Amino acid sequence: PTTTPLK
Ligand SMILES: *[C@H]1O[C@H](CO)[C@H](O)[C@H](O)[C@H]1NC(C)=O
Ligand SMILES: *[C@H]1O[C@H](CO)[C@H](O)[C@H](O)[C@H]1NC(C)=O
Ligand SMILES: *[C@H]1O[C@H](CO)[C@H](O)[C@H](O)[C@H]1NC(C)=O
């Protein structure tokens, strides 16, 4: 699991 560029 990973986090995506929090816009
Ligand atoms: C986050 O990065 C990891 C690294 O292996 C995976 O590619 C995962 O699928 C990524 N998550 C998203 C939402 O792209
Ligand atoms: C996803 O967001 C989290 C929380 O800020 C971390 O910064 C993480 O390094 C991010 N993942 C990517 C691939 O930039
Ligand atoms: C990153 O963006 C993806 C959509 O491509 C998802 O909304 C994911 O939940 C996001 N991650 C964060 C930490 O907001």
**What is the distance between the alpha carbons of residues 3 and 5, in angstroms, rounded to a whole number?**
7
**What is the distance between the alpha carbons of residues 7 and 3, in angstroms, rounded to a whole number?**
11
2 lines ligand 3 (CB under 6 A): no
* Protein residue closest via CA to atom 6 of ligand 2: 3
The 10 Å CB-count burial string (b at 16+, else e) for 1-7 is eeeeeee
Distance 7 CA to ligand 1 centre (A): 16
Residue 6 identity (one-letter amino acid): L
